[PDB]
Amino acid sequence: GGPLAGEEMGGITT
Structure with missing residues (x-):
């Protein structure tokens, strides 16, 4: 997301 x-x-976390 x-x-x-x-x-x-593809997420919001590295």
Whole structure:
């Protein structure tokens, strides 16, 4: 859900 790595589709977590 965001510009980082957390969910399958780019998340909000680095």
